[PDB]
A paper describes a structure:
Voltage-gated sodium (Nav) channels govern membrane excitability in neurons and muscles. [name].7, encoded by [name] and primarily localized to the dorsal root ganglion neurons, has been explored as a prominent target for pain management. The S1-S4 segments in each repeat constitute the flanking voltage-sensing domain (VSD), and the S5-S6 segments enclose the PD that is responsible for selective and gated ion permeation. Here we report high-resolution cryo-EM structures of human [name].7 treated with drugs and lead compounds with representative chemical backbones at resolutions of 2.6-3.2 Å.
Our incentive to solve the structure of PF-05089771 bound to wild-type (WT) human [name].7 was to verify if the chimeric VSD can faithfully recapitulate all binding details. The binding mode of PF-05089771 in the intact [name].7-VSDIV is remarkably similar to the chimeric one. As coordination details and the molecular basis for the subtype-specificity have been thoroughly discussed by Ahuja and co-workers, we will not elaborate on this one. Whereas small molecules like PF-05089771 resides in an extracellular cavity of VSDIV, peptide toxins like ProTx-II and HWTX-IV bind to the extracellular periphery of the VSD, partly immersed in the lipid bilayer. Per this definition, PF-05089771 binds to site V4EC, HWTX-IV and LqhIII to V4EM, and Dc1a to site V2EP. Site V4C has been extensively explored for subtype-specific antagonists, such as PF-05089771 for [name].7 and ICA121431 for [name].3.
Author numbering:
A (entry chain B): 20 to 192
B (entry chain C): 30 to 148
C (entry chain A): 8 to 34, 47 to 206, 209 to 418, 728 to 825, 831 to 1014, 1175 to 1768
The structure:
Amino acid sequence: GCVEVDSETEAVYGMTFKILCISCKRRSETNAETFTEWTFRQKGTEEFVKILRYENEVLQLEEDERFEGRVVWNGSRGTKDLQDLSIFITNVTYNHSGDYECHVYRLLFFENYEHNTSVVKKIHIEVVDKANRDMASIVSEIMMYVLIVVLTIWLVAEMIYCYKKIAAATETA
Amino acid sequence: MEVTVPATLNVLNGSDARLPCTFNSCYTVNHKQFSLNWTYQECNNCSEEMFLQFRMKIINLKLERFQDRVEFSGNPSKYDVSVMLRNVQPEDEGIYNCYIMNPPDRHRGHGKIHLQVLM
Amino acid sequence: GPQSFVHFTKQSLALIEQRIAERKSKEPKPSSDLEAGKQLPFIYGDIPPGMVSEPLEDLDPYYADKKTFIVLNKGKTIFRFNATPALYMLSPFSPLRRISIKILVHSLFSMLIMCTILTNCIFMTMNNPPDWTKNVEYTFTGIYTFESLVKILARGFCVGEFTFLRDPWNWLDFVVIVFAYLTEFVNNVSALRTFRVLRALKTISVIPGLKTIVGALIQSVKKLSDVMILTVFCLSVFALIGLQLFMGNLKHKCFRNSLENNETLESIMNTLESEEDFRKYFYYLEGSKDALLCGFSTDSGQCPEGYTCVKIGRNPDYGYTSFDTFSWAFLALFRLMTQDYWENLYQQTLRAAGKTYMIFFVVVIFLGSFYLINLILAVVAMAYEEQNQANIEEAKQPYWIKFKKCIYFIVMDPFVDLAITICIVLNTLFMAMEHHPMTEEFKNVLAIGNLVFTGIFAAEMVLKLIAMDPYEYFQVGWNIFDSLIVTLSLVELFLLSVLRSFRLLRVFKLAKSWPTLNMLIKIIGNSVGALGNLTLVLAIIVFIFAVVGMQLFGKSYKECVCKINDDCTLPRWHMNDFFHSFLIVFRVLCGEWIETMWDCMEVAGQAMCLIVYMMVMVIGNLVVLNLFLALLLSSFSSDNLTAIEEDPDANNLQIAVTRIKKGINYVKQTLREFILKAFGKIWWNIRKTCYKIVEHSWFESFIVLMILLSSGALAFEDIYIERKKTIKIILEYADKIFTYIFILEMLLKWIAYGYKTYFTNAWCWLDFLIVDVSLVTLVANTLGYSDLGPIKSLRTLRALRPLRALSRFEGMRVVVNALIGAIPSIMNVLLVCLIFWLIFSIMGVNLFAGKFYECINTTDGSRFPASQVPNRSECFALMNVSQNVRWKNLKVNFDNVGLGYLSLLQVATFKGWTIIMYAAVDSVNVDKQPKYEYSLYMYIYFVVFIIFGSFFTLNLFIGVIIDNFNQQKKKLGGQDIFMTEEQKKYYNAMKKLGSKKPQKPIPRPGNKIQGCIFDLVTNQAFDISIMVLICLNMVTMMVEKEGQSQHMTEVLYWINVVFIILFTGECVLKLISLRHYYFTVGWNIFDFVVVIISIVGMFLADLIETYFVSPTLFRVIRLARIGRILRLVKGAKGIRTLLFALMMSLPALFNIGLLLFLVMFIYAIFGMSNFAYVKKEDGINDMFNFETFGNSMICLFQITTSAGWDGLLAPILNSKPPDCDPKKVHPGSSVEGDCGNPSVGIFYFVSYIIISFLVVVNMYIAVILENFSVATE
Ligand SMILES: CC(C)CCC[C@@H](C)[C@H]1CC[C@H]2[C@@H]3CC=C4C[C@@H](OC(=O)CCC(=O)O)CC[C@]4(C)[C@H]3CC[C@]12C
Ligand SMILES: Nc1[nH]ncc1-c1cc(Cl)ccc1Oc1cc(F)c(S(=O)(=O)Nc2cscn2)cc1Cl
Ligand SMILES: *[C@@H]1O[C@H](CO)[C@@H](O[C@@H]2O[C@H](CO)[C@@H](O)[C@H](O)[C@H]2NC(C)=O)[C@H](O)[C@H]1NC(C)=O
Ligand SMILES: *[C@@H]1O[C@H](CO)[C@@H](O)[C@H](O)[C@H]1NC(C)=O
Ligand SMILES: *[C@@H]1O[C@H](CO)[C@@H](O)[C@H](O)[C@H]1NC(C)=O
Ligand code: NA
């Protein structure tokens, strides 16, 4: 239904990147009206500045040079009940490195009861020249190869031992 | 609705008359919705006079023909809507009706009492 | 001998009195043949004409001394009376008593009483009788008074021996008469009329052979004393456990956080009456009458944002579902034992307390639901066996002539009968082609085919009737049945919808050659034949319960209707009239009683409805079980004796088969003749070392561990796999390693065994197929073929890799061997019940095809009335006007034969059947809006289907499965078929445990004080006092309830502490007296462990409750208090034997449970693969779905008992809009669409429920075998 998956923390210069922000409401059958706001604090800077605000199926982009013409919407479409607030970067530059905040303002409609809640998600993005391969993949691949090698040498040694023993037994008879 | 009333009630002049009216309803009597009407008519084809009604609480209309001699003598929560006529006079002779509506019961209850006053 | 017949005269009475006087001055069983109510022996021959129905002298020498006289009827029935004058007036020689006796023994008397009772029973079904009825009631009363007076005058009243009041069945007549007169003279009307149902019980004493059936039913109960005690004890123990664990959990509700006008929870809760006002402060799901449950743990139900979980308010289901007091907990545990709507309670408890508490429900189901029911069936099985064994044991101790002969020659056994059989098969296949969206040409073809078949069958009937004489024709029952079918078809041709389905019964004509269909014919024939009286008793009991329920609660349903219905109209199930009251009783017999009992308790109070429902459940289930058992055993052993040859008269099918064996073989041989006329030690050492490698124990352990690791890695691939990147990559590389390992293992087996040996083994074939699928998947992924549709679908086949564990574990191997050996016998009965269900499916298509469509308002999901929108065209016009309007059909219906099969499967399992019945009884016509109970009497269709294809079909299946497993045991020497060799050794060792000779008496200590304590503890009064102390402790635990004050909690805890101190003192005294001999008894070891855990647990619970904050830990640790009450089974010998039988059954149950767990694991992996993204409607929701492995196991354990499988199937039947959205976007995943696959889902659920049925039947049979061995050894 809805799974909250964290964003990738590494983007490569010159290509595209998607920043993931998923905010699933606690019960799926409830009806809500959601809008989101994104703030970004670049490396070497302290103040979070607003970069975009998505509401009513339209994206409002702030007048920022580092994001003008470079951000498109990648979240939930065709509804006011947004559970995916992701954005998409078309041309990653070194100015997109820093910390992002994904403010989710969800208004839930109940029987004679309106609840205005809010969620904040923080994403750290580092812009690099080349895609650094994950440690998990490298370690798992190396471990797989060494495990296969160990198993095959163990089996080979056991076969040679048994073959020598049975050949000696045959020669005895 | 089953309404338990005496068909004929003979009460001495000057004495107190209790007019019993009880109903057997499945549902609990909700005071915020229980309705009770006590009317009086001189004859079966005569006009009915509203003198004691329960809309939210006991409302006694204080009719001039009864002075202040009409009192409530029942308990709606206990299915008893009886009324009391203190110091019954000869003019009190007539027909007394107790209308009962106890939602969500669909049917309307109606009991009739013929009060006769002897010397 | 026969000459011993003489009128009873005054001289005979004088001689008898003189003999009695001689006996008195001086100061043996009678002939069972001459016993009253029996046929006079044939040794006496006929009776003189002037001697019948006259007071005669006593024949029996036993009563020849006392004063008696016997009257014999024309039917040679012996009736014994008392020579003492009736009420000291009427003597046997008096004309008045003579006439009374003459009336008493006659056929027109009993027949008149029968007719009167039946007419009164018919009149009893009226709920609002007219005013002309009272005269008929007075006539009924007068008729009964007539027979009562006749019996009193003839037999005397009370003083004598064979008088009116000595017979227990005349007490019912006297009670009826006195009640009728007393209540008539005194004048609750319902109470008085419920007493009139006792007249329906006079049916037992008038129809012959009913009293013996009732006596046998009473006898069967007396053998159930120990099983009922054990059931009550187990239910009480589990009710205490549930009370301790789930107390107050069902009161949790989602209460809103923000309140205006300075409001607080207590201030709200005392000003709320209606559910409309409750819905403004608590969270309700749409269309629900109870508030949504919640919990405080992370694995419980979740409240929406803006609400907080709090324990407040009433319990669900009008408040009748709770674990708050011992009584409600006991009701809940009884509901769990009977598995009546238990999935609802299971879901509520998991929502309110957490998914971890599924362990409680698994244990409860296994012990109470499965094992306790097992003992009930087993004990009744032995009771009827011993009754059956005793029964047989005491029983043994010109031109017209020419052309008729020409036609007779035309009727050939090899050809005409085979042609007729082929025509019957083609006909039943032809009517299986009917379906709702059927064009006019197809209907024309079906009609002409049906007419042609009818014409041919009529021609056959006419030819057979004119060939051999009509008098000879109607001698054979099959000919009569064929004639009835033909005339019914002709009557239909001259003209209902049901009558068109009467030509389905010609399929039963194949039973002449089909032997297992003839078994079903005999089973059905016996129920109405040799067992007709038992079926009649069952029918009478059902009728009595229906009329009693209607009289007691019928007006309560009408007056109190608004409590159980928002529209203030009668619900679907009620007792206002006789038909619906009978439907309620039938549904209770089917196993569903809790939901109607809630409404009954709401409209009429708890006590009366509880008593009535419990009585109905007990008596009805007992009688149904007795009928089932008698049918099973009769048709199993008594009917089959191989009296005649296999088709003693050479079967026409067999003669035709012999003719075919001649003809085809001869023609083929002649065709062949015409064609002929026209025209290297090293490799052996390698094989040996590979063999030595594979066969070793370390290799087997390594492969087993690889199988377990590879199977467990499947459970991690859920919808949350994207939150676990590292584990995902690790699992991919581990899958590569596993594929490599199993490929190497396959190669080693190939070298060691050779292709011939490897491919003659079926387990090796399974491993080969699995490894080839894995290798194809691995190769496809590497060469870029990873997202192809067939390749992606082939990836889901990895869920079959746990099948590699079947060969490795011996228990699953033996259980699979048993199932595979069972398969051949199952298939024939499967074909029989498929034909039987095909008949009902064709009838259902005839009745209901295309009539379940309705115009509903989608937002609230309610059917529109029939005053507006009475047609499909009007529905489409309404859609043109209103948006939320849909002309919707049921997913499971009778549109075609396959859907009819699915509907019949749902009805037979009673899961989702009620919706089908409502649709069927609201049916009007095709493209017509349904009306409420328009076709009300189509409930008869479902009742008949249940009775035949659910009761008799299961009867046949069990009957054949018994013989199959009996044959399986015999061929292997009688050993247990569900057990391994080491399990057999441990089984024998445990057998020696339950048969030990009384051990040596415990040496007495020489010390004075020690010796006195020894005599004190050894005495039986000590053990009895300990038992009553345990009972008092049980009562003390029963006192505990929800919401009790802290003072009461402290008092109960201190009483428990006193009990613990007393038990510890008992243990210390036993230790002092018996010294080291105390530890030589297993029960003493159990008691020692119990007292230790009691003390430790009480102190730990105190520490947790005061110094810690852990209610869950407190409630879990408090379970050690159960050990004290488990010692009650020490004194109870019968329940101890039953528990010994259970522990005997445990190993085979362990093997079958392992197989079931493996099947559940495979189906769970497939469920997460397939149904993880379906819409959350019906039985699928936020907590019970296929998103994770745990949720899938939760769902599959529930449907192992078949509970709620329809609700899980329903969302997967969605395949097209607007039912589902094929382009549904799921955040956090690339999967698109919330649609299910109807074919895959149907196959999934049907196969799972069938396999669960087979495995559960295995568990039943195993437990039965251990119980039967224990009770008769
Ligand atoms: C072992 C015995 C008991 C059963 C042997 C199978 C046949 C006797 C029956 C069972 C299922 C039947 C089928 C069930 C459903 C259909 C679909 C039906 O067509 C539709 O439903 C079309 C619907 C549409 O066009 O909208 C045509 C007949 C057919 C193939 C039936 C043909 C006859 C079948 C194969
Ligand atoms: N807390 C309290 N109030 N009043 C007396 C006490 C008390 C006094 C002492 Cl000296 C020790 C502990 C005490 O507390 C208990 C005593 C019990 F007996 C049970 S028990 O009935 O559940 N029995 C049981 C067996 S194993 C787990 N529990 C539960 C508890 Cl908390
Ligand atoms: C189906 O239902 C409608 C219900 O109104 C049937 O009645 C017709 O309704 C229209 C619109 O109200 C009227 O104008 C017609 O006069 C009604 N028919 C007649 C004969 O009076 C309608 O006939 C039904 N159609 C079908 C196909 O059964
Ligand atoms: C995200 O944006 C890219 C670039 O415009 C587009 O191709 C893609 O379809 C979008 N995906 C979603 C989830 O909207
Ligand atoms: C508390 O309730 C009172 C009414 O009893 C109200 O007058 C007052 O304003 C409330 N105060 C708060 C803190 O809401
Ligand atoms: Na039910």
